[PDB]
Amino acid sequence: MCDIGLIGLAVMGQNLSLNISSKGFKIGVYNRTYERTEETMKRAKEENLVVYGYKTVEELINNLKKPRKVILLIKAGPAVDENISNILKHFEKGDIIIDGGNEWYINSERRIKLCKEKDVEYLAMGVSGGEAGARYGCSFMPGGSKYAYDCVKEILEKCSAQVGNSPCVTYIGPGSSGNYVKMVHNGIEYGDMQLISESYVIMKHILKYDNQKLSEVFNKWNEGILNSYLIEITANILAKKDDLTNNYLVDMILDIAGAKGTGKWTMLEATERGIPCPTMCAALDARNISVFKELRTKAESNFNKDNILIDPNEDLNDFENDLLNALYCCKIISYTQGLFLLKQVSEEMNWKLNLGEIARIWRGGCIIRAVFLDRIANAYKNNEKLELLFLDNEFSDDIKNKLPSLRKIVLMATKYSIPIPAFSASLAYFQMVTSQNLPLNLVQAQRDYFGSHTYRRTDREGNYHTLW
Template identity: 40%
Template sequence: MEQAEIGLIGLGVMGSNLALNIAEKGNKIAVFNRTPDKTDEFVAAAGDLRGQIVPCKTIEEFVAAIRPPRPIIIMIKAGDAVDQQMELLKPYLSKGDIMIDAGNANFRDTMRRFDNLKDSGLTFIGMGVSGGEEGARHGPSIMVGGTEESWKRVEKVLTSIAAKYNNEPCVDWLGENGAGHFVKTIHNGIEYADMQMIAEIYGILRDGLKMSAVEIADVFGEWNKGRLESYLIEITEKVLRATDPIAGGPMVDMILDQAGQKGTGKWSVIEAQNMGVAATAIEAAVAARILSSQRGERQAAEGILGLPSVTPAAVSDRKAFIADLENALLAAKIGAYAQGFAVMAAASKEFGWNLPMPTIAKIWRAGCIIRSQFLDEITSAFTKDPHVANLIVTPAFAGMVKDTDAALRRVVSYAALGGLPVPALASALGYFDAYRRGRGTANLIQAQRDFFGAHGFDRLDGADSHHGPWGSGASAA
């Protein structure tokens, strides 16, 4: 019997869809699930693809069904469950076999697993997969971290199943150990920021301009034909047009304003802090989700404090204001992407990954949640200057920031004066203003630090004097 080219453990929604995608692209795949009935159900529902699937009831049978060196995708809940599954697999594996974690893993766990296998003859791939259920089934964006040799073993299969952009597969090897999962983490951090900014614009249209869900859908539909064309803008229009089958009104108006999160956004913020990189838009988006989850507290606070005693200003030229909102969203989006790529650049140096920035932008152009027209321009910018300090100082993006700066200021001002919360949009504006100012105000902070803790400072004139004349009061703090 012909052996499978690859194996997959875990036939949940994502695992099942990924397995069907692999089979559909002409690759024979062995599958195993802890619950045998689930395997039977999966094969029964596979239809014409059944012939490409080798269902297995035991780990021993599963491993034997795969052509060595055996690549095995583990598609189960991230965390301890992955470690446990790896331990169950190890006794049956041979030198050169590859265990692949395709879940939303913390990249530090991936690095640990990679290192733990170094002297075992086995190896590990941390594989970021973006695109949700639809992407897994029809073509995701795939970010691979591991040895180059292990990548070569799976390249053919992964290239066949990945999303395509202008016939280019949205998959590549990004570096050793945790590189793939780190890039996926930052992808998700940017996704958090993008979604929050869209929600803030929606809030201005709903609560400032008093527009209905369908009217707002029309706005997003128009934007999706221009520079904001993207998957998230596209689905926002669809969400806003959907009708609640129970109450009959807009579906979005019946949904609790409590956003969930699974950890990747938080990890991206933590790692930005660890790397010493400002990622204020992503931080604001994660904080906004946390606040959204505290619905009871927010309702109680409204009862005590009331809403701000202001109302959004009347808009005399609605068309011009909506154009401002479009440009503000574009500007803030640039800020979020710039921050995400800056975090990746810092991590690349920290861990010796040599992350290929143009390649990352390329593989995000299709299949993933943040796919957009915008990524073509990012690809071009990083191709021209792969080591640029920040995306916003490349010629193309510097021009876009200058073009959209005034609109972002007007929108943030309108929201602040009208009592409408826009933490991500405001943080993007603050980031631009701080990043572009050659002399900021941290000189005062350094003076304060020296006053209470004798931490010292550097002088503008370079003189060899690093403490101020604070007097005896300095030590009192």
């Protein structure tokens, strides 16, 4: 009697089941800890929604309409694998499994094959949106069996974030491609947060803004081109006051935030495949450096970081707005890397990704949600062969106009010893990608000198070795 089943009831699983029930579907629900199943049934009652809770997995399977559809929301590990083996004992041909956890795409392919051994269709689907998006509308990135996609197609459209009258869901492609896109989403997310945090330090230590002015400036950026979900919450976060002190709450949070899970994976994949992603290096550098706080505090003791004395006649009259352009400029540079990675891998995997559709479903629901993504989607609507994003005519002119703002931000942060790795990496990236000739001619010569690795020439074909 149920349209769909759901396994795993954290607050994200609870919100999504109420979201599916909220759109008129008969939702079955399971959790190994039964108390969470009941807590979901309580709030369903208080929101005048019906969710059927079961106590064992196999008791849930029996109450779904055929072909059976189950969403998995188990923390990645051996537990997701046990459940799939357990689900397979009772499924038959045509039944559908949907894994919604953040999974390394190789594990999903390996399961996608094991399930076709039993004639079960698998759908590895990334979901982004936090608990709020889980309840009211998030971005679904399902990939795998096209057949499985069409049977769940209705349900995912209505529970996804709605931008205009298009839902934030699309068929990503075959195999484990959806896991991969959700990974690259988290990669871009890591870059945006680092670029934002570097804007926080620049205005705090160069313009000497207090937290109230900082929150006011971020709200003003969120009305302009930098309109984004993360820019909005930074305005809220920097304004929030502590209840246990007179301080601002953000100034009382400890700065140890390591690179967890899906962040490393996109960088590992960029390293292995030779697709450079400098802005994510800088973001991961920043996170990994923060774990060694004890070593950082003894480091600063030896190298005194004194207060920053701004030069009295240094031109800062337009600086806030130059920083606004620099940050926009780095977002173009940072997304150019991310979408380039996705295009290269899509070709190596015969995935046929539609980056116009990937950008479109990221306009709402997900964490990197922003008006800026709607602009990326139009770049691909305008040319689907587009290889680098800043080679679009409108992004081209944006770069040409705002790059001097980026050069001014890096010049001033360098002058006053403010660490800005993501701004530096993005500017350095842009200069290199736009350089027809790079000094790797000397690198090839050095390698031929000591290893006899040969080199190639500008004027003629073939490998050449020189006796130096």
